[PDB]
Design a protein around this ligand. Sequence first.
Ligand SMILES: O=S(=O)(O)c1ccc2c(c1)Cc1cc(S(=O)(=O)O)ccc1-2
Ligand SMILES: O=S(=O)(O)c1ccc2c(c1)Cc1cc(S(=O)(=O)O)ccc1-2
Ligand SMILES: [Cl-]
Ligand SMILES: [Cl-]
Ligand SMILES: [Cl-]
Ligand code: NA
Lengths: 242, 242
Amino acid sequence: MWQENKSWNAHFTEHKSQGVVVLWNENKQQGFTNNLKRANQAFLPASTFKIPNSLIALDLGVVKDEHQVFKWDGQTRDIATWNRDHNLITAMKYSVVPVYQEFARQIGEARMSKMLHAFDYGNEDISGNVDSFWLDGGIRISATEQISFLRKLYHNKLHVSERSQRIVKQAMLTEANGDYIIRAKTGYSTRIEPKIGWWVGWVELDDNVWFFAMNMDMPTSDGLGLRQAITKEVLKQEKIIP
Amino acid sequence: MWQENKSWNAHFTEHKSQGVVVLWNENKQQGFTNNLKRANQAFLPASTFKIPNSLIALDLGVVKDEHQVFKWDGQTRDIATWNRDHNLITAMKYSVVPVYQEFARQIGEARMSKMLHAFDYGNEDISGNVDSFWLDGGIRISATEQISFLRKLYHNKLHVSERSQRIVKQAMLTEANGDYIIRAKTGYSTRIEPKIGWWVGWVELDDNVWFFAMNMDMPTSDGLGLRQAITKEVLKQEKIIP
Ligand SMILES: O=S(=O)(O)c1ccc2c(c1)Cc1cc(S(=O)(=O)O)ccc1-2
Ligand SMILES: O=S(=O)(O)c1ccc2c(c1)Cc1cc(S(=O)(=O)O)ccc1-2
Ligand SMILES: [Cl-]
Ligand SMILES: [Cl-]
Ligand SMILES: [Cl-]
Ligand code: NA
């Protein structure tokens, strides 16, 4: 049910980087990865936590819907896309950290904790600040655990309303053409070593869906584009996308 | 306001064709079109009717969700992609008429009539066969009446459940980008003259959404690609998309 395929290491070697790509064929119920040990290694989720965060905030009424505007607080920060107004969809696309830090503060630690235990999310530990634990706190999740989380989301089986799950899957939209749809979330763990980049989500085809979760060492922000590029190369190699 | 911009007719005559593009700017509550009379002329919706027909089917339980499979009945039809199993997503993408004819027969004339009345859809007239009235019966809808119908859909304001409207808006997904999202439905009125091609939906930007409804004369299926091509050129002229 899980098969190791180190063909894909060649895609990490070229860009002088290392990491893990994990695919899951949903129809056949079979998993593939270049490195099953790192596949089960738990790191900080970083901005991939915006997926469970969105669900909790929506199911609790902190966020009314995907159209609610969240005004910029006036403190100009070092990423240009952060210094403007945002809704749920744009706050996710640009990983607007302070928007989600406000969601977290209003969710509170007690309710945040019960929801992560309900979601089966990683080690389910929110040690640290409630508004930064996914960046520098105790939470840990492996790539396989990301897949398990994403499958429950895809099947509307997480312990939230169907409406919350449909909104977040709508917000996860990244790319779509006549061949496929990609719903995913990027992540850049920047505050605690090892600095790693994430990309987790799934590829919707006509007659299948392929879940993926990847992470890789990211010692510099100049390598962030590799997260999508390397994962697409693996998808191309396994004829999943043209 | 409404404003007529005949500049766009260049795009129609460069391909020896004739049609109307209707644009609605949601944030500014202002509309635009190259031909105001044709914008309010009502044609057969053809397969753009798959939008209301999906909503009704989902809301009534004829279709339980978007994963439910409608298996091929074995009759080999002229369009290759019709001769296979489908779900709601792929049936909509490939305008699989026989799957939607089955929905119409299970909905029946009475409930279908009542729903279009509540939807305020076009002339609300299902005269003709219960499973082909949108292709050769008495139903008619204008391009602006399409905008008005899509606007309620986008805002979850139709009489059907929020769940129905969110599922259909998912199935409408056509193209998604770092710059925009397009939810739309294609149509081709082939049975009653004049043969026309449709494209209706909207373009989601970061802070705005542009609704559009277009139709054009279509004597032959060879020119169906001009629907999207001409609409995108208009979107490029108005600097909505890059
Ligand atoms: O590539 S993305 O995953 O979209 C991405 C790109 C940049 C940053 C983040 C995510 C999260 C983050 C946190 C911080 S901070 O903790 O220093 O405040 C600084 C930059 C970024
Ligand atoms: O470009 S699309 O809007 O996706 C499109 C393209 C072809 C056809 C349809 C839609 C609806 C349709 C009906 C018929 S029939 O009435 O003769 O059975 C034949 C062909 C087509
Ligand atoms: Cl889904
Ligand atoms: Cl979507
Ligand atoms: Cl459902
Ligand atoms: Na059609």
